[PDB]
Every structure is written in structure tokens, then in C-alpha cells.
Amino acid sequence: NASAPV
Amino acid sequence: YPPVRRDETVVDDYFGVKVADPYRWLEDPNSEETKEFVDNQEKLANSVLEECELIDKFKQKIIDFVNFPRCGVPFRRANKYFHFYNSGLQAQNVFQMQDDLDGKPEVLYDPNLREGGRSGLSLYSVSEDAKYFAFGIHSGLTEWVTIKILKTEDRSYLPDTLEWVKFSPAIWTHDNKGFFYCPYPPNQEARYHFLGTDQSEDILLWRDLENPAHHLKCQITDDGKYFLLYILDGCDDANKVYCLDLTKLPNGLESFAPFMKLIDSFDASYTAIANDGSVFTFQTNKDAPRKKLVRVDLNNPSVWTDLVPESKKDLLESAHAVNENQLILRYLSDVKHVLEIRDLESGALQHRLPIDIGSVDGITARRRDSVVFFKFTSILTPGIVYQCDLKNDPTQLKIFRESVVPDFDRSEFEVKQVFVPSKDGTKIPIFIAARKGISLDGSHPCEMHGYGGFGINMMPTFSASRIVFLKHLGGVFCLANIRGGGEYGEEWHKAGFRDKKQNVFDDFISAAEYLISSGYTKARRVAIEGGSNGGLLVAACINQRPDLFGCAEANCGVMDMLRFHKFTLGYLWTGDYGCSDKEEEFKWLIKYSPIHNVRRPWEQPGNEETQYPATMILTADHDDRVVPLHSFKLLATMQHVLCTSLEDSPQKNPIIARIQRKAAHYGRATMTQIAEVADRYGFMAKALEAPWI
Numbered sequence A: 001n002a003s004a005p006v
Numbered sequence B: 001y002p003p004v005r006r007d008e009t010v011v012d013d014y015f016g017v018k019v020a021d022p023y024r025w026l027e028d029p030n031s032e033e034t035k036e037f038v039d040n041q042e043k044l045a046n047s048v049l050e051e052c053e054l055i056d057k058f059k060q061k062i063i064d065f066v067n068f069p070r071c072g073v074p075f076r077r078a079n080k081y082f083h084f085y086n087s088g089l090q091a092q093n094v095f096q097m098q099d100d101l102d103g104k105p106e107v108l109y110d111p112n113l114r115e116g117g118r119s120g121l122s123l124y125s126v127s128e129d130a131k132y133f134a135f136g137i138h139s140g141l142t143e144w145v146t147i148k149i150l151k152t153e154d155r156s157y158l159p160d161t162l163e164w165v166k167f168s169p170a171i172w173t174h175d176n177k178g179f180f181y182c183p184y185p186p187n188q189e190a191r192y193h194f195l196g197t198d199q200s201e202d203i204l205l206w207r208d209l210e211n212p213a214h215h216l217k218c219q220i221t222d223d224g225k226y227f228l229l230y231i232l233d234g235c236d237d238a239n240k241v242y243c244l245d246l247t248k249l250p251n252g253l254e255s256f257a258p259f260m261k262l263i264d265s266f267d268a269s270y271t272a273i274a275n276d277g278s279v280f281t282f283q284t285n286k287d288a289p290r291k292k293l294v295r296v297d298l299n300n301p302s303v304w305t306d307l308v309p310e311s312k313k314d315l316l317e318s319a320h321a322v323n324e325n326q327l328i329l330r331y332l333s334d335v336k337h338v339l340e341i342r343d344l345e346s347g348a349l350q351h352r353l354p355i356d357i358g359s360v361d362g363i364t365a366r367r368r369d370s371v372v373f374f375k376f377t378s379i380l381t382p383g384i385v386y387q388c389d390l391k392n393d394p395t396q397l398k399i400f401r402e403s404v405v406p407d408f409d410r411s412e413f414e415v416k417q418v419f420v421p422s423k424d425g426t427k428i429p430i431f432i433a434a435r436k437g438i439s440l441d442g443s444h445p446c447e448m449h450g451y452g453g454f455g456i457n458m459m460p461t462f463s464a465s466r467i468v469f470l471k472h473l474g475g476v477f478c479l480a481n482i483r484g485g486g487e488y489g490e491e492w493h494k495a496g497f498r499d500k501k502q503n504v505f506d507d508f509i510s511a512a513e514y515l516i517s518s519g520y521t522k523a524r525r526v527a528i529e530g531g532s533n534g535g536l537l538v539a540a541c542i543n544q545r546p547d548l549f550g551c552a553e554a555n556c557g558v559m560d561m562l563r564f565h566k567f568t569l570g571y572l573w574t575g576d577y578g579c580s581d582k583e584e585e586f587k588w589l590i591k592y593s594p595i596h597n598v599r600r601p602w603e604q605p606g607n608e609e610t611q612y613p614a615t616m617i618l619t620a621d622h623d624d625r626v627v628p629l630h631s632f633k634l635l636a637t638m639q640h641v642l643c644t645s646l647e648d649s650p651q652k653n654p655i656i657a658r659i660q661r662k663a664a665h666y667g668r669a670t671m672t673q674i675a676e677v678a679d680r681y682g683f684m685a686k687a688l689e690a691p692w693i
């Protein structure tokens, strides 16, 4: 559940 | 370079081989000397990074590209839908609920209100009736979680507080009275928790004091009739299956367990996909390294039958029962997904949908759902949630949500897959992304990523920072699917583990050689990057072929392969790596252990022009998964061997650590992760002498 595709 | 003390007295005998460990003292993270090391390295790092004048340009471009709303794949409980949301730049994703897929969302839990969103949700479970939400909260920087339960109707907490949990799910019974979970004692256990009770009252279903390292996963069948307990050892893709019939208990779980031990060895993997009463469909790798589906009746448990036989070529990565009587199978075919729809009962193929370069994941639909949702991403596709309504329009994927990167025209770039020979001839698949129409004249900076271990499949997903690299540094990106992964089944994994771990490194090195020969880049304009087992990949490769690389970025790598098994969860990796307690395995490990194989390349005949790439070693100061001593010892060793042990070393490329303060392995708030990646790319651009475009 990563907060953003950095 | 700061002064770093060597303790010249520390020496160990491994089966007659004397190994000195002058930075043993860095294994104590609490000493003032270690904290001074960290302070000194941070100071050095900052001093190098302030010379990297494109960090701020990368940072803002990454922020701008990441600033788009993202709606995660929804799942259903009772009449309600649940999903994660981020407006673009929130530290962590917010868990939302709605009555209708296109209706107004309500916030159920917002991690950003706690500790400024240092950590997001990893445990999230909703009850079958949609009335309760159980989730995990980290207390401090440790891995320990507390489970709390909120009522969805008014967002009020229950008093229930369950401690001593790590990665357990919360698996609800269909009577909504409570859930199974797998805590540790104040030797993992399987417990059942009743709502409205103190944790001290939870029912014990399983423990094994005679095998304290065995660990647990669990599941309940879609009909609510069976509790399944899976028992695992280490990191191998293999497990036991114990089944408990909940319909036969005289007095429910209060009755307490009498498991039916369907599988009681560690010979193969087994995941339950579906059942009709006592007749079960499993996914398994038994005699099937590319996996298959099999069927067994619990009432006749010796007799297993193939339902979907193993493909001669493709991994059956996952399988999902849906729409009452169908299966969606997710195949991985030369590292690209293929989705098949099949009949559950006969196993017969109905439809087949090959997917473009990218990755489909996140199928959470259950057997009783007729709409299946999933997520697609790719290097040039930020994120689509697709829906397939198996009842009313089975043949069509429809776009349900579509992420849009601001000011990104995907048609200026292209991604291809090619296959390249490793030392032993084996074909290694690689993805290559770049601006369309570039000349293969050797001039482009190149970034290559890989992992190579633990049966992990490396997929070409979306990264905003990679687009900045491609567009604003004119970069070529490569993702290499080396052995040790699971991409071609268990034989691919095992061709890159234990005594064959070196194959992994040779594969990666072979990919870089191809990118040079083919004219994408040149020796010393190649940057390599990897994390954890991938950090080991980076460190071994630079020790073995420093001449190939201009920049190396190793994230929380396993660097002392002689002593890794002694710290926190390092003991679980001996399945892939071996262990230096055993002479034969020592003999594999000493040849590639990064801190034991730092050598001055310029002292090798013919190799007088060669130095180590500009190296950034990254780690969180409180990584409890991969302890940071790995990184610190490698840093100290490199700095010494290559720089401060000489009066005027040829090693001009900087060797630094980017140490994240007050960070665990998990967390990665948006801005924290963006800061890290900005630093890693600014450093790379400086290391490769690459101008901003």
C-alpha cells in the first residue's frame, strides 16, 4: 500500500 | 573523509580461514562511537550532495509528476465498497468507504493524522457485514503493531486492543463475531478474538513450541465453513495446510484444536482457491515448478487430481474464483501478464486476454462477486483500475479509474523487451525504456535495476522519478529479470540461489554488457540500483566488475554475508543464501560477501585505469529487517580500502551513505520517499556527468 509511485 | 577507527584486534576463524573485522564496533547502533560515525557520514554526504546541483530540479519534477489523485482497487463487503485514496501528495493513502461505486466517499481511517503519516496501513480488514474495520497501528519505529477495531457506522472505536502482532491478517468469520489472527507471545500462535473481549480471553488454536521458527498464515473459505492454517518455514515457497471445519464444532470456537492435517510437510506450496463442501481447489507447485491447479476431497485426502495442468512455459502466478462458477488465472508469460477466464468445475478455458508490458495485480474479488476489479500499471502507464462485469459483459475490460500524470506525454517514449545471453547462455529478459528515436551511439546515461532472489517477480511498473530520468536526463532505463526470481518458475529461483547465487550477478553483469555492446550506453555511464537482496546485488557487482559502472546505489543491502544470519530476521534467508556456520556454505559466501571483497581495482594488471563507481549506500537508521550495520561496515571498508588507506588514492568517485534519520524499513511517507529518490538521482546525474534537459 505505497502512498505514491515514486 | 572522516576518521573511522579500525579495531585491528578483531579476527575470526572460519574453518581455518582468518577473517578480520576491524569495524565490528559498528554492529552496536547505540554507542557514541557509532552515533559519531553516523553524524560524520551524514556530514560528508550532505557536503557531497550540496555539490549535486540537480537534486532540487529532480525533487520538484518528481513532486509535480506524483501530484495526481489515485483511487485504489475497490472491494466489496455486504453492500458497501472500500478502497484507498490519495489526493496526490498526502503522506499516506486514506481508507474510504462508499455505498455506491460512484457515490460520495466517507473517510474511515486517515493515517496522516497520526505521527504525520510516517506509516500507512498495512493491516486493513473489513467484516463480512461491513460493520467493522480492524487495522494495525505502529506505536513507534519498531515492527510491532496494535490492532484496533472501528465501527463503520459512526467511526467509533471498540475498546478491544490487540498487541504483539506483526504481519498477521485479521480473518473474519461469517457470523461477524470475531476473527482469526496470528500474534506472538508477550513462537507465533493462531488465535481467535471475539469482539467485545480483552485479548487475554482469545482462544488458542495453534502453537508449536518444538518448532519456534515456523510461521503462520491463515484464511477462511468463501462459504465461511473452513478455517485454513498454513505453516511455513523460512522463506521457501512451500507450506503445510491444516483445515478446521467450523460447521462441526459443538459450541463454535468457544468449544476450545482438531485440525485435519491435509498437508503436513514442507515439500510444496498450496493455496486454497475454492471449495464446494469438502471438495477443494488448490494452486500448487507440487511436481510443477511453473504451478498448476489441483483438486482434492478432504474426505478422501490421499487422492489429488489436476484441474489445470502446469504450462510447459508459463508461471501460473495466481488464481481467483469469481462470479460463482469461474476462475481468473493470472499467468506470467515472459514477464508479461496473461489473464484467462476458465470454468471452475471443469477447468476449461473460456477466454484469454494477453496484457501489454506492465503488471496486473490487486484482484480481491471473491467467489460471490460478479464484477472483478484490478490494477494495471506500466513504465509509461501510471495506474488504471479496470473492471470486468462477468455477469453482464464478460468479454470487455472497462476503465473504471485512470490516473493522469500532469504534463507527461507518453507518446514521446517507448518500452521494449529483449533477451540477452548470460555467461552460461541462458536467456535473460530485460525491459528497456527511453525516449523514442534515440541514437545507439553509446552516449546515454543508463540506470539498471534488479533484485534476483526469493522467487520475487520484478515487474515494469510505474515510477514518476523514472520518467524524470528519461525526460530530463535523456536516460535509458533497464529492468533486468535475472535468475533467483520466480519469473520462469521454481527452476529460475533455484538457478539463482545457494551455491548458484553467483549466477544472479553474472546475469546482471551480462545485461550491462549488452546495453554497452548494443550502443545504449558505455562502460562508466551505467548506474545500478537495488534494495535489500538487490542491495547485495549492487555491492557484489561493483566489487566484481567496477569497470562497468559509473554509479552504484545500494538500498539497505545485505553486505556481511558471513554474519547476516545473527541479526533480527536474517536467520530466515539462509534458505536462499546458505549460512557461514556450515563450511560448504561458507565457501559460497566468502567469494561474494560484499564487505569481504572490496579490492583496489587499479592494482590488477591491465586494470590501472579503473576505480569504483560513485557509490551511495542508503539505509534507514532503524531498519529492523536488514540491520544498518551492513551498510555501515561496507561504507567503512570501502572508504578505507579505496581512499583513506592511501596518501593520494586514484579513487576520486565519492563513496557516501545516505542515512535516513528516525526511519524504519517500512513507512515511506510520500515526501520522505521523494526526498530520498531526489538525492539518489541528483547524485547519479553528477556521477555520470549528465546534464539536465
Ligand SMILES: C[As](C)(=O)[O-]
Pocket: B454, B531, B532, B533, B534, B558, B573, B625, B626
Ligand atoms: C528482505 As530480503 C534480504 O529477502 O530482500
